């Protein structure tokens, strides 16, 4: 159908918007603390602590498969990165502090992306 294609053009454009959003969020992690999954070879007990791991490479794979239906699902994954870190790591660690700074700095990007998604439809 002609509609399914119109739909696919919007999903593709949403993917396009979310890609720029992801790049902007990832720039706020210059240390690359959140770039890749926590290694289960190096933290073998990780899944006993964190039940839904997330990281920026995993979000990117989902994004490029057009696996994000709306901005809300995308935010869910971003929030997992931050919240998992703030639980596993103590307050006085470089990792926890990195998560706080990503949360704070990402808020601004996400604020405008929500306006852009509502605005563009």
UniProtKB/Swiss-Prot annotation:
Residues 9-113 form the Bromo domain. Highly expressed in testis. It is found in: Nucleus; Chromosome. There is a cross-link at residue 41 (Glycyl lysine isopeptide (Lys-Gly) (interchain with G-Cter in SUMO2)). Scaffold subunit of various histone acetyltransferase (HAT) complexes, such as the MOZ/MORF and HBO1 complexes, that acts as a regulator of hematopoiesis. Plays a key role in HBO1 complex by directing KAT7/HBO1 specificity towards histone H3 'Lys-14' acetylation (H3K14ac), thereby promoting erythroid differentiation. Component of some HBO1 complex composed of KAT7/HBO1, MEAF6, ING4 and BRD1/BRPF2. Component of the MOZ/MORF complex composed at least of ING5, KAT6A, KAT6B, MEAF6 and one of BRPF1, BRD1/BRPF2 and BRPF3. Interacts (via PHD-type zinc finger domain) with unmodified histone H3. Interacts (via PWWP domain) with dimethylated and trimethylated 'Lys-79' on histone H3. This is Bromodomain-containing protein 1. It comes from Homo sapiens. The lineage of its organism: Eukaryota, Metazoa, Chordata, Craniata, Vertebrata. The chain holds residues 555 to 674 of 1058 of the full protein.
């Amino acid at each position: 159908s002609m509609e399914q294609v119109a739909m696919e053009l919007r999903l593709t454009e949403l993917t396009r918007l979310l890609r720029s959003v992801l790049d902007q969020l990832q720039d706020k992690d210059p240390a690359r603390i959140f770039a890749q999954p926590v290694s289960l070879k190096e933290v073998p007990d990780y899944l006993d602590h964190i039940k839904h791991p997330m990281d920026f490479a995993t979000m990117r794979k989902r994004l490029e498969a057009q696996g994000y239906k709306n901005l809300h699902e995308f935010e869910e994954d971003f929030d997992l990165i931050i919240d998992n870190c703030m639980k596993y790591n103590a307050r006085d660690t470089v990792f926890y502090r990195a998560a706080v700074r990503l949360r704070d700095q990402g808020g601004v990007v996400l604020r405008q992306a929500r306006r852009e998604v509502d605005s563009i439809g």
